[PDB]
Design a protein around this ligand. Sequence first.
Ligand SMILES: O=C(O)[C@H]1O[C@@H](N2CCN(C3=Nc4ccccc4Sc4ccccc43)CC2)[C@H](O)[C@@H](O)[C@@H]1O
Ligand SMILES: O=C(O)[C@H]1O[C@@H](N2CCN(C3=Nc4ccccc4Sc4ccccc43)CC2)[C@H](O)[C@@H](O)[C@@H]1O
Ligand SMILES: O=C(O)[C@H]1O[C@@H](N2CCN(C3=Nc4ccccc4Sc4ccccc43)CC2)[C@H](O)[C@@H](O)[C@@H]1O
Lengths: 591, 591, 591
Amino acid sequence: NAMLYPVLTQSRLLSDLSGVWNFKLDNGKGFEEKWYEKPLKDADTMPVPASYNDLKEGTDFRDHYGWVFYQRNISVPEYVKSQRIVLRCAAVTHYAMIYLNGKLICEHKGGFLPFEVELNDDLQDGDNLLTIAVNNVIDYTTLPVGGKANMSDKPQNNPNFDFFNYCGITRPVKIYTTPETYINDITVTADIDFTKEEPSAVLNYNVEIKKVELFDEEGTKLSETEGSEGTFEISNVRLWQPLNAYLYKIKVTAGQDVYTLPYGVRSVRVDGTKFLINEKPFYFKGYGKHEDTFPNGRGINLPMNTKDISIMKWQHANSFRTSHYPYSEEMMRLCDEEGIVVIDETTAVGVNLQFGGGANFGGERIGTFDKEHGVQTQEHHKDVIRDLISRDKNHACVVMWSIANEPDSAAEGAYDYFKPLYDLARELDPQKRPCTLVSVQGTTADTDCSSQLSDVICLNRYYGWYFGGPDLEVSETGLRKELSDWGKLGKPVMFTEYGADTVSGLHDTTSVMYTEEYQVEYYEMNNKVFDEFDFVVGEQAWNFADFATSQSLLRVQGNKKGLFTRDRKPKMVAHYFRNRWSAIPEFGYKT
Amino acid sequence: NAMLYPVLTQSRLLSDLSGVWNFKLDNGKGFEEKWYEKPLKDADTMPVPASYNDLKEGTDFRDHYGWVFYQRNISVPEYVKSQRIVLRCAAVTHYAMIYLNGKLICEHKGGFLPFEVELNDDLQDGDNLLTIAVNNVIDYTTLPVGGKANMSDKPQNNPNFDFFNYCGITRPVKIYTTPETYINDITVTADIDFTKEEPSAVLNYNVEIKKVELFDEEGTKLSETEGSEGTFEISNVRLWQPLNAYLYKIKVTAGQDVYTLPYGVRSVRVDGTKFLINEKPFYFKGYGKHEDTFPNGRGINLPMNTKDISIMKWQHANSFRTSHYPYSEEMMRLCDEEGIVVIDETTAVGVNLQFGGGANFGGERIGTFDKEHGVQTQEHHKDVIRDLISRDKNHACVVMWSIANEPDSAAEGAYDYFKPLYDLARELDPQKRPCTLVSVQGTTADTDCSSQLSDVICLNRYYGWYFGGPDLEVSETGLRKELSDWGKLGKPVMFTEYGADTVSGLHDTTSVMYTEEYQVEYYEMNNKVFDEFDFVVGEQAWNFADFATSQSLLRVQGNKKGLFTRDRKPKMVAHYFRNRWSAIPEFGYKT
Amino acid sequence: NAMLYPVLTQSRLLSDLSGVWNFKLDNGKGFEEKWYEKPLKDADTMPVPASYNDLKEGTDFRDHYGWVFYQRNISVPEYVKSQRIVLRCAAVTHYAMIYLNGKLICEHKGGFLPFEVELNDDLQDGDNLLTIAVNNVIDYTTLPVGGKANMSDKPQNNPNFDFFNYCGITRPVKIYTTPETYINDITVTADIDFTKEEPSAVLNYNVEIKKVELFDEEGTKLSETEGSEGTFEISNVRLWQPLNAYLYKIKVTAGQDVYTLPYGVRSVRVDGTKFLINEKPFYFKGYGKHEDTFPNGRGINLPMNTKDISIMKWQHANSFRTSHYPYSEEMMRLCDEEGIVVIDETTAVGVNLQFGGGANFGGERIGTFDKEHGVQTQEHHKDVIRDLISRDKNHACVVMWSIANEPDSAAEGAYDYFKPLYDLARELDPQKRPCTLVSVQGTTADTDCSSQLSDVICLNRYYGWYFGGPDLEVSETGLRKELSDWGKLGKPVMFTEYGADTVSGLHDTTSVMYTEEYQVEYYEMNNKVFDEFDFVVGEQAWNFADFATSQSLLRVQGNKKGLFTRDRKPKMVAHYFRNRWSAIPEFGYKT
Ligand SMILES: O=C(O)[C@H]1O[C@@H](N2CCN(C3=Nc4ccccc4Sc4ccccc43)CC2)[C@H](O)[C@@H](O)[C@@H]1O
Ligand SMILES: O=C(O)[C@H]1O[C@@H](N2CCN(C3=Nc4ccccc4Sc4ccccc43)CC2)[C@H](O)[C@@H](O)[C@@H]1O
Ligand SMILES: O=C(O)[C@H]1O[C@@H](N2CCN(C3=Nc4ccccc4Sc4ccccc43)CC2)[C@H](O)[C@@H](O)[C@@H]1O
């Protein structure tokens, strides 16, 4: 349910278990021989946190099918078993199974959101053998979704999505402590009064448990209130803004336990064809990104996180989307301090069995939401919407939720699949932030169950690449026509993906596809049409940087639609966008 | 003096402070306004650990001169002030100044070796403001050495060495605990009896403090001895080998404190023209490397550390040198588990004022060891040899010490400068491992104070690049002649650097410098001559991968002598070496 | 003396001998064995026209020293010996020696200008063995100048200039015919009357020999005059313009011989700080180029010539300079039709013994114009100014003459060396077009013998590369100061070279030298200062495209200062200039 970001507290420790662990690829005989009971024989080395896929050589290791075993000796002091000892796994991709001294203690499905387990009971005295087994198999029951081919009898994951299936202990595995009665969750909303020309705010609060002090940026304490629930009143409040963050601090002392949380006071609501942040008409400038670096894979990369942010501010972007899964907690906290607008997105990519040849049962092609042969994820999909919104509910950076990336949202079953999730999203988000789903090419205003369920229309369109390339003038005609029609909903339309594979170094004065000149022309065509429609409130390119995918004829050593290379070096287009975004403000570009 | 690697212990905590800290570049008014007393106003963000140089945009930030301020709120629990609270800085580059709540508590010179401070006294109750200031200025008093030009009035570091002056909190800043009477140091040597065809060993031990148990790889406990000093006897001992490591474990319980250490039992001594590991004739296959990745700078990179090791084993290398500074503790422990031969090297690069135009006092060119105007580092140089050997004395991977890289070792003052350091190196190394210094081009057997002080001759030669390029046949003649002469010392000769700048992607059937074909021909010429001399016991290419340097006409976006690119992608030469090293064994290549 | 471009004529044939000839590298015994008498034994193949250097593999072939032998069987019909049979060598680099059936018939020094020989006498009946020997040795007697090192006993050319010493039959070797009394030369000037708002012109003419008809573009015949000398009067004349050429045709029928010549009527004179084409204030937009393509070397490349022109018009350039030698006749005729302003430049590069360490006779460093040990080229230098101006005197494209590229023009002897050449240049150019010399970095207004001899000041400056790089702000200060001072001559100043080596593909958001971002910043800095001075009338970047040079540490597989790669693919800077030159007109940018 509730996962608070572990951070050093007068009440709580925090011991990062990150390092080189023992590691062994599982064969068929891994569990049969209960490798978790005894130290791993003939073991290899593996850093944690990290995707393991690129950290050893050979295709058989990169493309491994199934389980791997991590193992590390753990040891707490007796003088601290007094407090309760929690194990927090920031993320294990995809499915984890945690053993201690040989006994199962936790299982988790879902490889991109945190989970924890309590250790006091089975935590012995001395060096205990911690073993985490990680499974990477994807299918019709996982988010993301594994298919049966590219989007031999040798078992083989086949992603129904266009990124590499990086797995392992993606994010840090820490340990922290907690008074036996402790702060378990905290929720903070903000009603802002833009009536006073010098606006002020009142901050609802509540603390779940099983004394509240407010400070400003510099540590200036300002007010205090007692108890579980209550309120705060701030006048001349410093509003969190895009590219101009301000974080108040919040100290919740309750019993022998105290936790601090940064918070930004910020308004967001949609109003006709206008996305309004602090009651001003916003325009998204940014991109769809990945957690993808070398050689960490999906592994958390704090230096790259900061370098990416620096490149955004250098480029005059203001937002990105957590395509196609929730990002690290550290990244979220970082865009809080840095003032980056996030579109927080779930792991629900590949809910769409039209990709490739799909799957044919009884010779008949199976539809996405066929209830016997199609996707079997809505239960898991709901837990994801639950854990995600619980984890990130307080981040001022989060301005909206993306429930799915390119689902078969114009097919039979789609509305009935997505309605309970949209409902759960608006039910659980204390700030009632707008929800959306990113619509695959092919859908229309009429046919897209997004046209009703979603507060904002988010399109992934590829006119001038997949559709119309290399003829950019013909493709522009296509883009205007489809874009016009979307205006008939009187909702905000924004593009969450559009791009063109571009191999850094390829050029021609008379451009062809894959060259840097073509990439720039492609975006000039699209951006020209975007500017013609005052209900278009955002442009986010795909992708921020080149990233790794499964191999196919259509993937030139990964996805090459980045504006920057995988090591964040600009392509010519990166300087095109920097110059365009320099003349487009965060607020009032449309009005 | 003694720095043991902090790791979770039944007796000791370990709380990694790594994360995004507050950060501010210092102007002239930083200390005058005592920024350490109050939280940093108008502050920026910066991950730790990491070099800060590449993590924000703009030359003024990359090329910053002077101080920067890191700042993080810290907080321990009262239920633990019982134990002593230590702050361990794995490395701060170059000069650190640690404040707590506004009061100085530690200073350190030397940016590549660990130091600690005790916190109990000034560690208050609640959230304490931790501030670390970092200085990057280099000169004639620092190791490495800063010069006065490339190797305006605007203050400017000018490295007297060919890598970029990456600074910041390079390595992790952790906190661990310790019973008020604790294990402060541990030393373990090994006398091995190769008389028994099934060799066995006795392991001297000693514990400095202010119960010893032995286990094997799997945790099998084998023996026990009590007290500070003592011994162990192992028969049919499993010897740590190159590319075939075996680590025993060692559990030292003393009082309420217990620490475990991995140890590999291994022999090393030189014998005429033979470098002998476990009394067998070794041959170094590997490279000189850097701690250099993007965007971490010199910052510790555990995933790359493991990926590098995988590439070595893939390439059939067996060794590298910590050019030109001690590497992270984690890396050292890793080559212990992985069986990689290390040449542990100090920060003593640029002890050589002949680089560039040098410096001219009174119009006369200043010699390196001029006692009034030359280098002023021998005092610091000794502390480095002290801290380094103390830190890494137990690593089986360490096979030798490099006291300096390319000092002016054929100049007046050189012997008198290096003798006390060589002496201190052999005095302090409990295993009496061979010592050397890496000799710059130009020195001869006759003129090099290395010919007497050093157990092994380590050459950085560039015949076919700087010297003779592009004429490889003329250059080969030069290399044979100089290499012949070195054979007259009857000592082991090995090359620690040789290479050719190569821009990945450049090619010609008829090669020119900077192409991949030239790089391969260059190494074919050199390697041919190396094979002609049975006293040559090692080949280590410069460099393992492309890395960043200061800008100059001669540096094509860094140093391009890597066999791999900065993101570890092979150049054609990498496959040349893989194929050559496949047919060269670790032992008996020479005999 | 006079070389008219051979073209099919009712009076004259033209048989192109271009093809695969026999070819043999000369060893020491080539002439001793009179290989020219008998067909080449053990011969190789070689296309003509072409530089031979890159057309076979191996450094010994590329870096060959001395002579090579071309050989082709020739054969004319008897029914045509009636007319006189001429052999025209468009260019042989450097020194040629033409044999026929074994007998010497011609010698030529100078590898970039046409020469001919008459064949009737020694032209037998049947298949005659034509043999051309080509020498590539350069030294203090050749233009360009060969030095004694980079700018073993094994003989070796060492260019005193920064391009590769490509040699062979660079340009076509044709045969044409001629009535025994024939048109040998033609000269046409134009006095233009800009008094009439609808300007008109009178065209002086003269024909040297040993009927004149005028047509317009479409073949419209307009007027006629008889005899050797005479005149033409044209009203409402269509003026040849930059980027808007108009070529009249001219049919000179004299006896049994008739030749046609295209001509553009165009005015050029300098007036204070103004370069005036057709009495309007011109501004050069373009570059310094090379005749350099793969694999032709310096060999003529008509398709690239046209592709280059297309790229100029695409980029909005209007001019280039024939750095550093006269280009092909075909190229000149092409910029006539295309309206490209040419700066016609001689082979006089490397008249400057300060490059490198120079040469030291008697231990004393030899000055450039030292009359016993220095350059010995002024005699040859005059013949070059003679042949060049004779060849290209009628090309409307030629707007100016460059007598030398970067001579030691601020040294003792310089004025006395250049005065007789400047004089000869103005004496021989019927149109009295302005003359200049391109000034190496280091010279000033005061010290440059160009400040007096030259009508226009042409600078090769590298502030922000060689001088000041990577500090572009410091370098800009330097450039303004030197540029200011040049304004004190009240003459037109233009830059004929400025640039920065840039390896296509290298990038950083925070730029370093050799990246594409640095190249663009470099030109932004320079171009900013150029715009501050209304006496600056031209910007020509070095270079149009990457080109081949001798190997050295400072040459990353050739010269990388091109805006385009060697295969004419744009670097990012090419699009920077295209966008800047789009807003700068050909006329009136300054006024
Ligand atoms: O274009 C992109 O790279 C991004 O856009 C979207 N895909 C969704 C699917 N479709 C096409 N893609 C793929 C993807 C993987 C392998 C092969 C293809 S063949 C193809 C052929 C014609 C038209 C379309 C496709 C559109 C692109 C995803 O949301 C995002 O994951 C992906 O990265
Ligand atoms: O060649 C390498 O890249 C490595 O080898 C060694 N240097 C030592 C010095 N010298 C030359 N170098 C440099 C280095 C930096 C800037 C400029 C130069 S100009 C030069 C010109 C002619 C001969 C030699 C040089 C040899 C190389 C160092 O030990 C190691 O730090 C360095 O990385
Ligand atoms: O920069 C360019 O590439 C062009 O500009 C001009 N040279 C003239 C000489 N000098 C430098 N050059 C060279 C050239 C060849 C080899 C090595 C060098 S080291 C150097 C070091 C510091 C300052 C200058 C130089 C200026 C550049 C020529 O006119 C043109 O031939 C050449 O191509």
